[PDB]
């Protein structure tokens, strides 16, 4: 369930597709917060026209190593 | 005048730091382990 959640977050609330075209400048992000009580500030400018929390789990690099290029596969 | 000499710290600091504590520790150690008659 946890792994499926990681793949779902990388497929619907991430910037993996944009990060593929620029992995040296775009920060990996796979978590977005809802705009409530002023917490939207946590959705930082990670690059690629995306706003979210910079993840450090390394799922982007692992997916790139496996040959995943689209959100449909995730 | 009561002013101590210039060499007073060079004699009192080593005394109070090594001679007096060694004597006090030795005497106290002998007193603690002394057996009652």
């Amino acid at each position: 369930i946890w792994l499926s959640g990681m793949y779902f977050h990388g497929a619907r609330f991430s910037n993996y597709e944009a990060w593929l075209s620029d992995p040296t400048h775009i920060k990996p992000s796979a978590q977005v917060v809802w705009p409530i009580v002023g917490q939207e500030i946590l959705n930082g400018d990670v690059g690629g026209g995306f706003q979210g929390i910079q993840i450090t789990s390394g799922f982007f690099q692992l997916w790139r190593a496996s040959g995943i290029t689209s959100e449909l596969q995730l | 005048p009561f002013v101590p000499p210039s060499w007073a710290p060079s004699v009192f600091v080593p005394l109070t730091g090594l001679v007096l504590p060694a004597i006090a520790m030795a005497t106290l150690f002998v007193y603690i382990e002394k057996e009652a008659p």
Binding site: - | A26, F29, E35
Partner: protein
């Protein structure tokens, strides 16, 4: 009952330990102290000479190291004397070293031997 192993039951190590002055059991305690003190002062003079605060300055590194070793030997002699005073207070054959007079003579012999060992280690480097 107890655990016996070749380390604690080898005859070679038993003979080596019996040959040491502490396990002689029959010589004068002052002679034992002199021997132990010499053997200890000779090795003790080394660390203060090669690692003390004055180890880089010449013609005084050995002087300071030997003086420091002599002071350490004096402190150890005082420790031996207080140990003997606080250990023997009342009451094969019994070793005379484990007695008030025996341990006092042993401490005095250790002091003389330690100072002689320090002085010998100082002149051995000249």
């Amino acid at each position: 009952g107890m655990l016996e192993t070749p380390v604690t039951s080898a005859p070679i190590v038993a003979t080596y330990l019996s040959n040491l002055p502490a396990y002689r059991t029959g010589v004068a305690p002052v002679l034992r102290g002199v021997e132990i003190g010499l053997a200890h002062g000779f090795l003790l003079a080394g660390p203060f000479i090669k690692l003390g605060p004055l180890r880089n300055v010449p013609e005084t590194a050995e002087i300071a190291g030997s003086l420091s070793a002599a002071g350490l030997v004096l402190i150890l002699a005082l420790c031996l004397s207080i140990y003997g005073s606080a250990q023997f207070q009342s009451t094969v054959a019994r070793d005379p070293l484990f007695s008030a007079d025996g341990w006092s003579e042993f401490a005095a012999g250790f002091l003389v031997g330690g100072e002689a060992g320090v002085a010998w280690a100082y002149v051995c480097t000249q």
